[PDB]
Amino acid sequence: QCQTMTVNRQMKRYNVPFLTFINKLDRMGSNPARALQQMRSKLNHNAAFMQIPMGLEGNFKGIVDLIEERAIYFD
């Protein structure tokens, strides 16, 4: 949105590396692919993928790292 675009402009004009984290994944409106496509097209960033969900809305249980091929089962 607007504030995200302004913070992105500042961080890109002063060159600050960062990583994206997605929060609140326990509602009936989870879609990381749409947000990633927005970051690709609407902004001037690069594509990436580090975690895979196993169920949304009311089925969030854990995440994967897809770097060591070993998911995490939070308890």
Binding site: Q1, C2, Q3, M5
Partner: protein, 75 residues
């Protein structure tokens, strides 16, 4: 007039200061965040008769509020 760049445009406006009470709020609400504006002093122009009557009534209420208005509203 109106300018413009690659992504958006740049409007050249000419609005008096009397009609600048809550222009930022509606300008933002009608632009979805990514809209800004700058204001600077220009010149002077003749006043509209509605605002003329408004400022006349205001000066009358400030000086003596009992020539007709509140003089008849109370008696």
């Amino acid at each position: 007039g109106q300018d413009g760049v690659e992504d958006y445009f740049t409007l050249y406006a000419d609005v008096p200061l009397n009609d600048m009470f809550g222009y930022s709020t509606e300008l933002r609400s009608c632009t979805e965040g990514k809209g800004e504006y700058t204001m600077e002093y220009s010149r002077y122009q003749p006043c509209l008769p509605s605002t003329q009557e408004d400022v006349i009534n205001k000066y009358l209420e400030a000086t003596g509020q009992l020539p007709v208005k509140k003089g008849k509203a109370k008696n």
